[PDB]
Amino acid sequence: PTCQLEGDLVQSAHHLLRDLGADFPEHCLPYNAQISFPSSAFPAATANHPQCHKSLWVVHESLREAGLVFQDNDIPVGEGGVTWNDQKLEDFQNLQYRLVEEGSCLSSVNGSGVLSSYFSNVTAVLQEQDSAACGWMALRRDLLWVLKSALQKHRTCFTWR
Numbered sequence: 253p254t255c256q257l258e259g260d261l262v263q264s265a266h267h268l269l270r271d272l273g274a275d276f277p278e279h280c281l282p283y284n285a286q287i288s289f290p291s292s293a294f295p296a297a298t299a300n301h302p303q304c305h306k307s308l309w310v311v312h313e314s315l316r317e318a319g320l321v322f323q324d325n326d327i328p329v330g331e332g333g334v335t336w337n338d339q340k341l342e343d344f345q346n347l348q349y350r351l352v353e354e355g356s357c358l359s360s361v362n363g364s365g366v367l368s369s370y371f372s373n374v375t376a377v378l379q380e381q382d383s384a385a386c387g388w389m390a391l392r393r394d395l396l397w398v399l400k401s402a403l404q405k406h407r408t409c410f411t412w413r
């Protein structure tokens with residue numbers, strides 16, 4: 253295994269996740285107290301220090317932990333649920349799985365608890381029926397940002413073509 257995250261998969265995962273839903277709704281704003289992605293998890297790249305290992309770790313670990321969230325929690329669909337494109341969701345999850353498997357070496361090093369703490373807060377919101385839809389929408393918002401930011405600020409860390 254060459255342990256690399258393929259940029260084309262990351263870009264396509266971002267596009268599918270973008271296209272399957274809508275903007276984060278105003279009524280979900282209070283959940284930002286609980287679901288606040290630690291943007292400081294990404295390193296500040298400098299000349300000769302792209303910090304690709306840490307940047308790829310943030311992407312891989314966020315996708316791995318989100319995979320567990322999808323496995324362990326039902327998405328509500330009715331009123332009080334989310335209105336997502338289920339076919340594009342399945343396609344996103346297939347790309348997510350490919351990225352998590354190919355980057356397994358990035359999870360072989362224990363990281364700071366900063367990401368696990370974020371996902372523990374997401375889980376708590378998802379596992380109460382009255383807050384679940386907002387939790388799903390906040391998670392999607394943050395995963396979109398993780399993928400967008402990695403491509404915008406850490407493009408060189410992915411393998412292309």
Ligand SMILES: *[C@@H]1O[C@H](CO)[C@@H](O)[C@H](O)[C@H]1NC(C)=O
Nearest residue numbers: 285286287288366369370373
């Ligand atoms: C989790 O939510 C609590 C509030 O319920 C907040 O104080 C804490 O900072 C959150 N954890 C993270 C990692 O953001």
